[PDB]
Amino acid sequence: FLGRTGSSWFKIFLFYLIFYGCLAGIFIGTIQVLLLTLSDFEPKYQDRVAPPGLSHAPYAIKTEISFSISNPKSYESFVKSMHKLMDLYNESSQAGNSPFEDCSDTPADYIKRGDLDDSQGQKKACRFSRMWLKNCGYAEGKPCVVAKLNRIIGFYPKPLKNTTDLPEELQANYNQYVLPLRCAAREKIGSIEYFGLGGYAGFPLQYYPYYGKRLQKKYLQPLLAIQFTNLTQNMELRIECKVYGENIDYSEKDRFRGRFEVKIEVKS
Amino acid sequence: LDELKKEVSMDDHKLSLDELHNKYGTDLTRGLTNARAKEILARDGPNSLTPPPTTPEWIKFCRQLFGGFSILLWIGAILCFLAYGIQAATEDEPANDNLYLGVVLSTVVIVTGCFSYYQEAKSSRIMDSFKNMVPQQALVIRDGEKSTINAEFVVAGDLVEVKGGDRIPADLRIISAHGCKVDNSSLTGESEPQTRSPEFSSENPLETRNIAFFSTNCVEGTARGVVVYTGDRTVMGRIATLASGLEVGRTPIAIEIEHFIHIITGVAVFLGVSFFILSLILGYSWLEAVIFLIGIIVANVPEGLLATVTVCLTLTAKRMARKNCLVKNLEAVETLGSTSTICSDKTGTLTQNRMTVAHMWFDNQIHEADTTENQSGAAFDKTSATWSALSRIAALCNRAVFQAGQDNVPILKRSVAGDASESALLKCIELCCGSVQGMRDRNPKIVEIPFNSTNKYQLSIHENEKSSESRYLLVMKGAPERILDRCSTILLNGAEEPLKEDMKEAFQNAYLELGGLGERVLGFCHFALPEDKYNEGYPFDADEPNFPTTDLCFVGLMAMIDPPRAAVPDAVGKCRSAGIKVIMVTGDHPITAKAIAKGVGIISEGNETIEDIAARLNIPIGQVNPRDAKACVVHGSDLKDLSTEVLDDILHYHTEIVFARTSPQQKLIIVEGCQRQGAIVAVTGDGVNDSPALKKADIGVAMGISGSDVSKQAADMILLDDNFASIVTGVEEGRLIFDNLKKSIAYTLTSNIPEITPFLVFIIGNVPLPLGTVTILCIDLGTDMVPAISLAYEQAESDIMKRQPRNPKTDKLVNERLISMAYGQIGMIQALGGFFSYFVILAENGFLPMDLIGKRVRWDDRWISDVEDSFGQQWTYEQRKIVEFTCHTSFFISIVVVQWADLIICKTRRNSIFQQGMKNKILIFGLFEETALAAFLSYCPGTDVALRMYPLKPSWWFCAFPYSLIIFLYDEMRRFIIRRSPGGWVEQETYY
Amino acid sequence: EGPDNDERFTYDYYRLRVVGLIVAAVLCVIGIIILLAGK
Numbered sequence A: 001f002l003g004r005t006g007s008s009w010f011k012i013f014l015f016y017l018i019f020y021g022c023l024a025g026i027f028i029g030t031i032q033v034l035l036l037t038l039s040d041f042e043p044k045y046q047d048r049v050a051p052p053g054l055s056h057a058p059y060a061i062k063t064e065i066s067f068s069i070s071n072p073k074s075y076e077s078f079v080k081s082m083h084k085l086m087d088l089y090n091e092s093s094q095a096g097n098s099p100f101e102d103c104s105d106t107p108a109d110y111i112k113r114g115d116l117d118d119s120q121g122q123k124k125a126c127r128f129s130r131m132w133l134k135n136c137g138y139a140e141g142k143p144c145v146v147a148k149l150n151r152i153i154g155f156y157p158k159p160l161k162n163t164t165d166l167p168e169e170l171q172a173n174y175n176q177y178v179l180p181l182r183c184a185a186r187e188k189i190g191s192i193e194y195f196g197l198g199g200y201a202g203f204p205l206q207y208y209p210y211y212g213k214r215l216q217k218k219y220l221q222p223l224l225a226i227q228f229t230n231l232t233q234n235m236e237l238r239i240e241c242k243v244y245g246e247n248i249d250y251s252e253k254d255r256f257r258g259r260f261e262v263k264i265e266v267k268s
Numbered sequence B: 001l002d003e004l005k006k007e008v009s010m011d012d013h014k015l016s017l018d019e020l021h022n023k024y025g026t027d028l029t030r031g032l033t034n035a036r037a038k039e040i041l042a043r044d045g046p047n048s049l050t051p052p053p054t055t056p057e058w059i060k061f062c063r064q065l066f067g068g069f070s071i072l073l074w075i076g077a078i079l080c081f082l083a084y085g086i087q088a089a090t091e092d093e094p095a096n097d098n099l100y101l102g103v104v105l106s107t108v109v110i111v112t113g114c115f116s117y118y119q120e121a122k123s124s125r126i127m128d129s130f131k132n133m134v135p136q137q138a139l140v141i142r143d144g145e146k147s148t149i150n151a152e153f154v155v156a157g158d159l160v161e162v163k164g165g166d167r168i169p170a171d172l173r174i175i176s177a178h179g180c181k182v183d184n185s186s187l188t189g190e191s192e193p194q195t196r197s198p199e200f201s202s203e204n205p206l207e208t209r210n211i212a213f214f215s216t217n218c219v220e221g222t223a224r225g226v227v228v229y230t231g232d233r234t235v236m237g238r239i240a241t242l243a244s245g246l247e248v249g250r251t252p253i254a255i256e257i258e259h260f261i262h263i264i265t266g267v268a269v270f271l272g273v274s275f276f277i278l279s280l281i282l283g284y285s286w287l288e289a290v291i292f293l294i295g296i297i298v299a300n301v302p303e304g305l306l307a308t309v310t311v312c313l314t315l316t317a318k319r320m321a322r323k324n325c326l327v328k329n330l331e332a333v334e335t336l337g338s339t340s341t342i343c344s345d346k347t348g349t350l351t352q353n354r355m356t357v358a359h360m361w362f363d364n365q366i367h368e369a370d371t372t373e374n375q376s377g378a379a380f381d382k383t384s385a386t387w388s389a390l391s392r393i394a395a396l397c398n399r400a401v402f403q404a405g406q407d408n409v410p411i412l413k414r415s416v417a418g419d420a421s422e423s424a425l426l427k428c429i430e431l432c433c434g435s436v437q438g439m440r441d442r443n444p445k446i447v448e449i450p451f452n453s454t455n456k457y458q459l460s461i462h463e464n465e466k467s468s469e470s471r472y473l474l475v476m477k478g479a480p481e482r483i484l485d486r487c488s489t490i491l492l493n494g495a496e497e498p499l500k501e502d503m504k505e506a507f508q509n510a511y512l513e514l515g516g517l518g519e520r521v522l523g524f525c526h527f528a529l530p531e532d533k534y535n536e537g538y539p540f541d542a543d544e545p546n547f548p549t550t551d552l553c554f555v556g557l558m559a560m561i562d563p564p565r566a567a568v569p570d571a572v573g574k575c576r577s578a579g580i581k582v583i584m585v586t587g588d589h590p591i592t593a594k595a596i597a598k599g600v601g602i603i604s605e606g607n608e609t610i611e612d613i614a615a616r617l618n619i620p621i622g623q624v625n626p627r628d629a630k631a632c633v634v635h636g637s638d639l640k641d642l643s644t645e646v647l648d649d650i651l652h653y654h655t656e657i658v659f660a661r662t663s664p665q666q667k668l669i670i671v672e673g674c675q676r677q678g679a680i681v682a683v684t685g686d687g688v689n690d691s692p693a694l695k696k697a698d699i700g701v702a703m704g705i706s707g708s709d710v711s712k713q714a715a716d717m718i719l720l721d722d723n724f725a726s727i728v729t730g731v732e733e734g735r736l737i738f739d740n741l742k743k744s745i746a747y748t749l750t751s752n753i754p755e756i757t758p759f760l761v762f763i764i765g766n767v768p769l770p771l772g773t774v775t776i777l778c779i780d781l782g783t784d785m786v787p788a789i790s791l792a793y794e795q796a797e798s799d800i801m802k803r804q805p806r807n808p809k810t811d812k813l814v815n816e817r818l819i820s821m822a823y824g825q826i827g828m829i830q831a832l833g834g835f836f837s838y839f840v841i842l843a844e845n846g847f848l849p850m851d852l853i854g855k856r857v858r859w860d861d862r863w864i865s866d867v868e869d870s871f872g873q874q875w876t877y878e879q880r881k882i883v884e885f886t887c888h889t890s891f892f893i894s895i896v897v898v899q900w901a902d903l904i905i906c907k908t909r910r911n912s913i914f915q916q917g918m919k920n921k922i923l924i925f926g927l928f929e930e931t932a933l934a935a936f937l938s939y940c941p942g943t944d945v946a947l948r949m950y951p952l953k954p955s956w957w958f959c960a961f962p963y964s965l966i967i968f969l970y971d972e973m974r975r976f977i978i979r980r981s982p983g984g985w986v987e988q989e990t991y992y
Numbered sequence C: 001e002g003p004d005n006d007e008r009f010t011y012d013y014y015r016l017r018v019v020g021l022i023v024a025a026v027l028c029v030i031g032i033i034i035l036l037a038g039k
């Protein structure tokens, strides 16, 4: 033929069949032992998610949400993702004492449901009403963005203490139980309005620590609705929403490390 | 074009002096007119040689920039700029990826260009050396007056004059001469002075006395002649053009390189476009379809391989430089290993090029002297009183002297003023009797008759050094038979005795044997003149026989020859044991050529020519079956009337071939004949008459000390110490580097698979990219470099000089067996070890292997800063990318770790590491430096930006260890099978 | 610890780099030693 005879062509096939078969069987074996060394409830390493990311619902083309108020299908793209998220926070999804629980309607302290063990059933998560998100189809004019803190197993988000000076200096400082979120731009051509649990501009600490998908399915993380009823129009406004805390940090590279990058433009 | 120049020349030495003048419109006495000479100048053109048109270095450099790998790397470099252009227009990408990768790849092509350019070097100044043989000026007779003119202004027809010490300015017809002798070594390779006279003495113009040639010099006397040829039209000017004009051609090693380039280029374009369409079918945007292709290019092309080859060659050439063997062309480092036939000059190559005493006949006994340079033999006789009598004649009846200031150099190497035979005798006595000058001071010469054409003897009368005598001793030497007709007694073991027919017959026997050995034989005799008949003041007349020259006492015979170099016989046998055919090709006479052939082992004992059979059986040569003769001796005059097909039959039908009295073109023809049969041929030589053959040879080797400038220009290799044993070393080195290149190539190729497979699974699996493009270049250009080179220092696995020369048609540098092992077996194991570490990194950070399938879409999505892992955690864009790049880093390090084992297995093709050992210090160096480089690239701060290399956790380093070990075991088991059964299965499938 | 389990999300990449570079250097020196056993 090309290389060899039929007899040789066969033998080279019988070899590579057994050979690659063995190699596949060995590869699988090493994957088995790897998995055997891992927990079902907690990942081996967590230093790469460490400082929590802050992500929002409006799917930004490039950290930007520009549209026209005087146009219907101009914002119907951002309403798709906005709906996708909030559709999960339905009351019909949170039914019965299992696996949900009614928690303080005001920001409270942490809740420990034991260890990362299966020695108990599904760890009961705090309910969250999308109805706590006042004012927010969504904002056809002047968007109503929804913030979110990335989930990390066993992470206890710790707010800053009012020992020294603060950006939003001491205003509504629920020091003990709220992780604040203050959006900014100089360039003050807007109108910041925050909505959340208990009416505070933060995340209620009663939703922590997260026990993971395996130990807490259907779990709901707290949301923080933000509305920009800015009196300006037809210009790119670089708005940055920042979260503050002891366990919260940022990076010049990762522009989502505990903060937002939104470029709103109501070009109408 | 040069087929005309490969033919024997035609001449006009047969014409009379007068007749020759009519042909050139010339005067025998007055010479040409100033006006007629200038007319002929413009007519024929200058008496000069024009160098052939060369290829500029520009075109030579750029021709390498387009050879398979460079072509693919160019397509990659441009395709980078393509994707970059498409980006800069569509979505403003502030990145530098495609732009920088395009710059990097273009640089890789340029630098790789320098390496191949360095390897494909051609240092040739043939025509320049020939031009150096034309004198600046010549002496001509014009308008009846002699004047010096620019030799280029010399034309056919003018009257030229030459004298001892000057170069022949052009081909001349001798019309007048006085004691003129010439050095025709340019045409023959033999430096013994040849007389020139107006008389025609041979039909063959290269042998007649009435022609003098350009490229030669007058050694003594004076001559006048008419110019018959000028410039390019001279006999050796044509040889110049032939030699300088000959097409170089591709070396065996070069052909091998191009061959695997085709193979690897083939699989590259195959998988390249095979997966380019396979991606579009899967619905991949052309934006991405090209990005994957660039990666495929980089994965398939072994970027550092061609440069490795060059370095391995260079390092092999450095070792040979250290044995006095200079390599002018890097590729010639290997040709000697692939050589199946050596065509060797005799004089100054196989031989020392110096008349040396070989045997002596005295006391009715043949004695042998030591002919070797360094005198590696033993003594023959010292005791016999006869010896001292013969020794005295050899010293006394000798007019040769050592040049001043030689006392530093060895006797046999020092320059001597005199003819070759007298120098030989001088050096013979000086060696075994001490200072000859002393013997010539103790015995003052009073009268002598120098060797005469008519007398055929030379005699001398000396004052006997003996005090009790202080009388007159007569000594003489000459033609053995002439000396015999002048002897009455023979000095036997001390005492004289009558010359009976018995001893006279033993003389003839001794004389015939020595002459049969191709040796020049001389007779020696002396006579103690009677005291009473010769007073202390008796005057001797040299002009008229004033003393007896008959009834003298015969002392002995001495024989001499230009002997082989000490190392030559043994080197010839070694070449022949390695299955190399050795042919002699010489301008010298057949009797001498044949005798040295037997001396060095070109013709082995018992082997006969058709002429030998005929003489032994006493039958006509036509009655001899030529197939009964394995040896042959072909004279150039017969070679001339043979067609190439008939020359091919001679080459095919004889194992032991001697081509004697060959012209320079004839040497070229014999070389081409050998090549025509498909053989790789080496030429060894030292004369300008070797230049065409040396050029045409696959590899020409010139002698460094004895070699002429021309020969060393025509060669690929120079033996700087004239050590013929270096050929044996050269062939051995050549074979070793050929095997080691295979090892180094397999090693380099093996790591291509773990660079290809990640890109394929990236498409078919939709997982995050396991390894990057930049990461690949860190391997092929970084870590693999020193290890790949180090394989050039591998010792032989067996006695390579015991095997036959490779068949260049069947035995390739890269074959299917190499690809099967490198691509199909070892590289495949490396790929898995890479993937394993990849899955380990991701799974330990929260992305278990199961959830990875079909995630790249969301993984690469720059706007999704919340991808969910297996544990329910959310990752930003840059966070998951850090893990991904950490995956690139550990995959990279996995390659390094699996290349550890590969380096050790590529060490040997057959033998076990437990047999060959670990005595390669460069290889071990490679292991340490490779690992140092990898660690530095991972842990050095800032490398995460320039190369996207991230720090690895200690446990990460050990992921591929079990795969590295399986490689070592697998290959060790496999080679154990090879050795345990030379049959073929494992052998014919995987044995590189 | 409980709410004070910050060490769980921390890794000393600084020490690892220091050690990694020490090792790389020493492997580089060791290599020179073995190579220079004859040049």
Ligand SMILES: *[C@@H]1O[C@H](CO)[C@@H](O[C@@H]2O[C@H](CO)[C@@H](O)[C@H](O)[C@H]2NC(C)=O)[C@H](O)[C@H]1NC(C)=O
Pocket: A086, A087, A088, A090, A092
């Ligand atoms: C989650 O809540 C949303 C609230 O808008 C539900 O949307 C309803 O969709 C139905 C049918 O398309 C409409 O008739 C209603 O007007 C919507 N709102 C309400 C309050 O009922 C959505 O269907 C819910 N999703 C799930 C899975 O239950």
Ligand SMILES: CC(C)CCC[C@@H](C)[C@H]1CC[C@H]2[C@@H]3CC=C4C[C@@H](O)CC[C@]4(C)[C@H]3CC[C@]12C
Pocket: A003, A012, A016, B757, B760, B816, B817, B819, B820, B823, B824
């Ligand atoms: C990534 C995976 C799926 C690709 C696997 C490719 C396999 C099938 C390839 C890789 C190397 C290949 C072999 C390389 C060498 C030879 C020897 C030659 O004389 C005949 C073909 C043969 C035997 C090839 C057959 C196919 C082969 C085994």
Ligand SMILES: *[C@@H]1O[C@H](CO)[C@@H](O)[C@H](O)[C@H]1NC(C)=O
Pocket: A134, A135, A229
């Ligand atoms: C939000 O909606 C409420 C009614 O639910 C209305 O009273 C109020 O004006 C709205 N706020 C703004 C800022 O438009």
Ligand SMILES: [K+]
Pocket: B694, B695, B696, B697, B698, B699, B700, B714, B715, B716
């Ligand atoms: K050559």
Ligand SMILES: [K+]
Pocket: B302, B748, B749, B750, B751, B752, B780, B784
């Ligand atoms: K490679």
Ligand SMILES: [Mg+2]
Pocket: B189, B345, B346, B347, B348, B349, B685, B686, B687
């Ligand atoms: Mg010679």
Ligand SMILES: [Tl+]
Pocket: B298, B299, B300, B301, B302, B303, B752, B755, B776, B780
């Ligand atoms: Tl490569």
